[PDB]
Amino acid sequence: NTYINGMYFAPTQTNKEALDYIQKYRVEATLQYSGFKDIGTKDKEMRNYLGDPNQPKTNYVNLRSYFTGGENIMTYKKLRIYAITPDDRELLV
Amino acid sequence: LGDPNQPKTNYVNLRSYFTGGENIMTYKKLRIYAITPDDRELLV
Amino acid sequence: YPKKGLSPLALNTMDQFSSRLIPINYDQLKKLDAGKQIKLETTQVSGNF
């Protein structure tokens, strides 16, 4: 078993300013029991990329802070973005 | 050299750049920035 | 105030006699670095003539 903890999303390229425009993320994942359920939204945070203290700060999905009791597997899940007024869509598997 | 009794010189942290891996003993270059113009110091 | 070709003024204290820089707790710090930005208003201004 491998379980997924979080997402150090998009380490700092030469040009990513549009990530500063984003405030909310929304995720649907598969639980260990009754997979592919809808989970609500949270707000992104700042963390150093790959945990190294000599690194710029990036956006992080803290997947543990949601309406889950179980864990996550290497199978199907979806990840939608909220820009401030609309909804977008970014990530899948 | 990390000595507690020495002056403080310039330093280039290569680790705080937009990378994911590491570097090897191969082709590399290091260019200066003055205030207005551009120049270069180090090669391999 | 000030003139146009000069930098703006700043406030960073809140006492009667200037000390004690303004505090912000943990939840407000997290929502502040979440990308949301603070807003500012004017209530009443006194002066002289």
CSV table of C-alpha atoms in Angstrom, one decimal:
chain,number,residue,atom,x,y,z
A,1,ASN,CA,0.0,0.0,0.0
A,2,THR,CA,1.0,3.5,-0.9
A,3,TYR,CA,-1.2,6.4,0.5
A,4,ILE,CA,-1.2,9.9,-0.8
A,5,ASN,CA,-0.7,12.7,1.7
A,6,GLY,CA,-0.6,16.0,-0.2
A,7,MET,CA,0.4,17.9,-3.4
A,8,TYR,CA,3.3,20.2,-3.7
A,9,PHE,CA,1.6,21.6,-6.8
A,10,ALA,CA,3.6,23.4,-9.5
A,11,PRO,CA,7.1,24.3,-8.3
A,12,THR,CA,8.2,27.7,-9.3
A,13,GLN,CA,8.9,27.9,-13.1
A,14,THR,CA,10.4,30.9,-14.8
A,15,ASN,CA,6.9,32.3,-15.1
A,16,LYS,CA,3.9,31.4,-12.9
A,17,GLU,CA,2.0,34.4,-11.8
A,18,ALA,CA,-1.5,33.0,-12.4
A,19,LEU,CA,-1.1,30.7,-9.4
A,20,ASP,CA,-1.2,33.9,-7.3
A,21,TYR,CA,-4.7,34.5,-8.7
A,22,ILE,CA,-6.0,31.3,-7.2
A,23,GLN,CA,-7.7,30.9,-3.8
A,24,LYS,CA,-9.7,27.7,-3.5
A,25,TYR,CA,-9.2,24.1,-4.6
A,26,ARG,CA,-11.7,21.3,-4.7
A,27,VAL,CA,-11.0,17.6,-4.9
A,28,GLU,CA,-12.8,14.3,-5.5
A,29,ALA,CA,-10.8,11.2,-4.6
A,30,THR,CA,-11.3,7.5,-3.9
A,31,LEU,CA,-11.5,6.4,-0.3
A,32,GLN,CA,-10.4,3.0,0.9
A,33,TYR,CA,-14.1,2.2,1.3
A,34,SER,CA,-16.8,3.5,-1.1
A,35,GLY,CA,-14.4,5.2,-3.5
A,36,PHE,CA,-15.0,8.2,-5.8
A,37,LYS,CA,-16.9,10.5,-3.5
A,38,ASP,CA,-17.2,14.2,-3.7
A,39,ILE,CA,-15.3,16.2,-1.1
A,40,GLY,CA,-15.7,20.0,-0.4
A,41,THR,CA,-13.2,22.8,-0.8
A,42,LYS,CA,-10.4,24.3,1.1
A,43,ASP,CA,-7.8,27.0,0.6
A,44,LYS,CA,-4.3,26.6,-0.6
A,45,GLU,CA,-1.3,27.2,1.6
A,46,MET,CA,2.4,28.0,1.3
A,47,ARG,CA,5.1,25.3,1.7
A,48,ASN,CA,8.6,24.9,0.6
A,49,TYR,CA,8.9,22.7,-2.4
A,50,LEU,CA,9.9,19.1,-1.5
A,51,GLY,CA,10.3,20.2,2.2
A,52,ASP,CA,13.7,21.6,1.6
A,53,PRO,CA,14.3,24.8,3.6
A,54,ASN,CA,16.3,26.4,0.7
A,55,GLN,CA,13.5,26.6,-1.8
A,56,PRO,CA,10.8,29.1,-2.8
A,57,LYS,CA,7.3,28.7,-1.5
A,58,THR,CA,4.6,27.0,-3.6
A,59,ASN,CA,0.9,26.0,-3.5
A,60,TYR,CA,0.0,22.9,-1.5
A,61,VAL,CA,-3.0,20.7,-1.4
A,62,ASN,CA,-3.3,19.5,2.1
A,63,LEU,CA,-5.5,16.5,1.3
A,64,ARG,CA,-5.6,15.3,4.9
A,65,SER,CA,-7.7,18.4,5.9
A,66,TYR,CA,-10.9,17.2,4.3
A,67,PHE,CA,-14.1,15.3,5.1
A,68,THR,CA,-12.4,11.9,5.1
A,69,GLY,CA,-11.7,9.3,7.7
A,70,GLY,CA,-9.9,6.8,5.5
A,71,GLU,CA,-7.0,6.9,3.0
A,72,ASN,CA,-6.3,7.2,-0.7
A,73,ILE,CA,-5.2,4.7,-3.3
A,74,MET,CA,-3.4,4.8,-6.7
A,75,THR,CA,-6.7,4.9,-8.7
A,76,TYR,CA,-9.2,7.3,-10.1
A,77,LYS,CA,-9.6,10.9,-8.8
A,78,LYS,CA,-10.3,14.4,-10.0
A,79,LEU,CA,-9.1,17.8,-9.0
A,80,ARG,CA,-10.9,21.1,-9.9
A,81,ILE,CA,-9.7,24.6,-9.4
A,82,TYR,CA,-11.6,27.6,-8.2
A,83,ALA,CA,-10.6,30.9,-9.6
A,84,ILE,CA,-12.2,33.6,-7.7
A,85,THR,CA,-15.4,34.0,-9.6
A,86,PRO,CA,-15.6,30.9,-11.9
A,87,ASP,CA,-14.7,27.2,-11.8
A,88,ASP,CA,-11.9,25.7,-13.7
A,89,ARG,CA,-10.6,22.1,-14.1
A,90,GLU,CA,-7.0,20.9,-13.9
A,91,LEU,CA,-5.9,17.5,-12.7
A,92,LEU,CA,-6.9,13.9,-13.1
A,93,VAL,CA,-5.3,10.5,-13.2
B,1,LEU,CA,35.0,27.7,3.9
B,2,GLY,CA,32.6,28.1,6.8
B,3,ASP,CA,35.3,29.4,9.1
B,4,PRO,CA,33.9,31.5,12.0
B,5,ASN,CA,37.0,33.8,11.8
B,6,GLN,CA,37.3,34.9,8.2
B,7,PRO,CA,35.7,37.7,6.0
B,8,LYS,CA,32.4,37.3,4.3
B,9,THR,CA,32.8,36.9,0.5
B,10,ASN,CA,30.3,36.5,-2.3
B,11,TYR,CA,28.4,33.2,-2.6
B,12,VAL,CA,26.2,31.7,-5.3
B,13,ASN,CA,23.7,29.2,-3.9
B,14,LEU,CA,23.0,27.0,-6.9
B,15,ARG,CA,20.3,25.1,-4.9
B,16,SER,CA,17.9,28.0,-4.8
B,17,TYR,CA,17.3,28.0,-8.5
B,18,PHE,CA,14.5,26.5,-10.7
B,19,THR,CA,15.7,22.9,-10.7
B,20,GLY,CA,14.6,19.5,-9.6
B,21,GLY,CA,17.7,17.4,-9.9
B,22,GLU,CA,21.4,18.0,-9.3
B,23,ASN,CA,24.5,19.1,-11.3
B,24,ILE,CA,27.5,17.2,-12.5
B,25,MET,CA,31.1,17.8,-13.8
B,26,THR,CA,30.0,18.8,-17.3
B,27,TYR,CA,29.2,21.9,-19.3
B,28,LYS,CA,28.3,24.9,-17.1
B,29,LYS,CA,28.6,28.7,-17.3
B,30,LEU,CA,28.3,31.6,-14.9
B,31,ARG,CA,27.5,35.1,-16.0
B,32,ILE,CA,27.8,38.4,-14.1
B,33,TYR,CA,25.2,41.1,-13.7
B,34,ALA,CA,26.4,44.6,-13.2
B,35,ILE,CA,23.9,47.3,-12.5
B,36,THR,CA,23.2,48.4,-16.1
B,37,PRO,CA,25.2,46.0,-18.4
B,38,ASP,CA,26.0,42.3,-18.6
B,39,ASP,CA,29.2,40.3,-18.4
B,40,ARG,CA,30.6,36.8,-17.6
B,41,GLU,CA,33.0,35.3,-15.1
B,42,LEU,CA,33.1,31.5,-15.0
B,43,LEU,CA,33.2,28.6,-17.5
B,44,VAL,CA,34.1,24.9,-17.3
C,1,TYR,CA,-0.1,64.3,1.3
C,2,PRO,CA,2.7,63.8,0.5
C,3,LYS,CA,3.6,65.4,-2.8
C,4,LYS,CA,3.2,63.3,-6.0
C,5,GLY,CA,6.8,62.7,-6.8
C,6,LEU,CA,7.5,61.2,-3.4
C,7,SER,CA,6.9,57.8,-1.8
C,8,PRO,CA,3.8,57.2,0.4
C,9,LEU,CA,3.7,57.4,4.2
C,10,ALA,CA,3.5,54.3,6.3
C,11,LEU,CA,1.9,53.4,9.7
C,12,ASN,CA,3.1,50.4,11.7
C,13,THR,CA,2.2,51.2,15.3
C,14,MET,CA,-1.0,51.8,17.3
C,15,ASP,CA,-0.3,53.3,20.7
C,16,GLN,CA,-0.5,56.8,22.1
C,17,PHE,CA,3.3,57.0,22.1
C,18,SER,CA,4.6,55.1,19.1
C,19,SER,CA,5.5,51.5,19.9
C,20,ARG,CA,3.7,48.0,20.0
C,21,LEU,CA,3.5,47.0,16.4
C,22,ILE,CA,0.1,45.5,15.4
C,23,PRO,CA,-0.5,41.8,16.2
C,24,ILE,CA,-2.3,39.2,14.1
C,25,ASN,CA,-3.1,35.7,15.3
C,26,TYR,CA,-2.7,32.4,13.5
C,27,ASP,CA,-6.0,31.9,11.6
C,28,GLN,CA,-5.9,35.4,10.2
C,29,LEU,CA,-2.3,34.8,9.2
C,30,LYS,CA,-3.2,31.6,7.3
C,31,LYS,CA,-6.2,33.3,5.6
C,32,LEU,CA,-3.9,36.2,4.7
C,33,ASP,CA,-1.3,34.0,3.1
C,34,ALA,CA,-4.1,32.1,1.4
C,35,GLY,CA,-4.3,34.9,-1.2
C,36,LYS,CA,-7.1,37.0,0.3
C,37,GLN,CA,-6.3,40.7,0.7
C,38,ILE,CA,-7.3,43.2,3.4
C,39,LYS,CA,-9.4,46.3,2.9
C,40,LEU,CA,-9.2,49.7,4.5
C,41,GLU,CA,-11.7,52.4,5.3
C,42,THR,CA,-11.8,56.0,6.7
C,43,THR,CA,-14.2,56.7,9.6
C,44,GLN,CA,-13.7,60.3,10.8
C,45,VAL,CA,-11.0,62.9,10.4
C,46,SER,CA,-10.3,65.9,12.6
C,47,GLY,CA,-8.0,68.9,12.1
C,48,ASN,CA,-7.7,72.6,12.4
C,49,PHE,CA,-8.2,75.8,10.3
